[PDB]
Amino acid sequence: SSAGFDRHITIFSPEGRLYQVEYAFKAINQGGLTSVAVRGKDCAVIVTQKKVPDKLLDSSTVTHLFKITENIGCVMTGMTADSRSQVQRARYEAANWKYKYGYEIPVDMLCKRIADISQVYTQNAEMRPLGCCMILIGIDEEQGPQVYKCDPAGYYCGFKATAAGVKQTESTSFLEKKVKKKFDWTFEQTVETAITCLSTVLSIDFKPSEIEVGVVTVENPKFRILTEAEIDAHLVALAE
């Protein structure tokens, strides 16, 4: 049910829903891509599709993985410009946090902050929510590896493993069965799980250039983006 402008602006419908927020979640899938983030014993990894259909593109500029701080990285799913805007805001909020507080912004706090900014779009009518989803990774000094996700709704949460995009529901149904099994979550097991989650859900045998992988380790907590050679290394291990 609809009444008045509840399908055009961010005001309640007669059931108490925000149709405009619901439509922003549908905008994430418009990009056609799917992302997966898995947390391990000593690491946190993010993986997403890298679709360069044109040789005319400079493939190095086609990415959904972004460095927010030295130790915090993210994967964006959804509308590209909205996502690049959100990453820019995340980078500013993180830098501003260190300037005022003299320590590095914890991953949960950066995620909470982005989620809080997003909630405003959900309550004020003049602007639309961003049709994008942010998944951040990083190693916490006291709490270990962290995977956090925030919504166009303003919701945010911490996760053992998570997904976003077209096949979010299928990837979470895969990940919750794999998390229920007995596993000593090593770096290799966390990376493979993320790759074979995206591969089984899309029914695609990946090539190095077809995906992109980002990682943070307790040994090396600086956000690291994997090369085609390092991605290939994990791909050939899965072929066995």
């Binding site: 460095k67 701080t69 980078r91 830098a95 260190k98 300037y99």
Partner: protein
């Protein structure tokens, strides 16, 4: 204060004394006046402590976000202009001189003076109340082509010489060597200082 920076082939050496004084009172005798602005960019602090620390912090914040937007470590020239613009915009309300030096993959080891909002690249530079007494020394002792070890020795001798003549300089000498390899921090204690004529 006596601050000093020397360019060499492949990096810079920066040094400072350690005395913080409120008139005739030494408030802190072991203060490190060499502050990192980035991974391979440092500044040497002199003048008003509150102003110098405020400028250094805003410059470090500005340069961090700059380095992330550019996906590269900032140029030492960008750090030099960031400090210089702040010092110049507020020249009537600020009373600090932040010498900016470091390393780049583009221009290598470079030393910059930001005195009163100006910007100049120098083979070496000296600053602080103590620099006054060592102008002749640095002019007589500086030689082009010095090695990283020869630069450290020069900075140490010059700063020790100023520390002995200047009531507002003293303590230990802090050294920092910035190269493509990384940064080496070093301390020459008040007992292990080089000796010269002192009567």
């Amino acid at each position: 204060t006596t601050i000093m920076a020397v360019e060499f082939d492949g990096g810079v050496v920066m040094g400072s004394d350690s005395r913080v004084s409120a008139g005739e009172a030494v408030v802190n005798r072991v203060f490190d006046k060499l502050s990192p602005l980035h991974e391979r960019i440092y500044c040497a602090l002199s003048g008003s402590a509150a102003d110098a620390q405020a400028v250094a912090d805003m410059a470090a914040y500005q340069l961090e976000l700059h380095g992330i937007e550019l996906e590269e470590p900032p140029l030492v020239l960008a750090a030099a202009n960031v400090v210089r613009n702040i010092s110049y915009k507020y020249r009537e309300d600020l009373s600090a001189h932040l010498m900016v030096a470091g390393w780049d993959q583009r221009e290598g080891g470079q030393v910059y003076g930001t005195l009163g909002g100006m910007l100049t690249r120098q083979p070496f530079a000296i600053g602080g109340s103590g620099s006054t007494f060592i102008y002749g020394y640095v002019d007589a002792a500086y030689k082009p082509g010095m090695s990283p070890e020869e630069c450290r020795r020069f900075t140490t001798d010059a700063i020790a010489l100023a520390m002995s003549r200047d009531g507002s300089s003293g303590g230990v000498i802090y050294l920092v060597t910035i190269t493509a390899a990384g940064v080496d921090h070093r301390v020459i204690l008040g007992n292990e200082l080089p000796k010269f004529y002192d009567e």
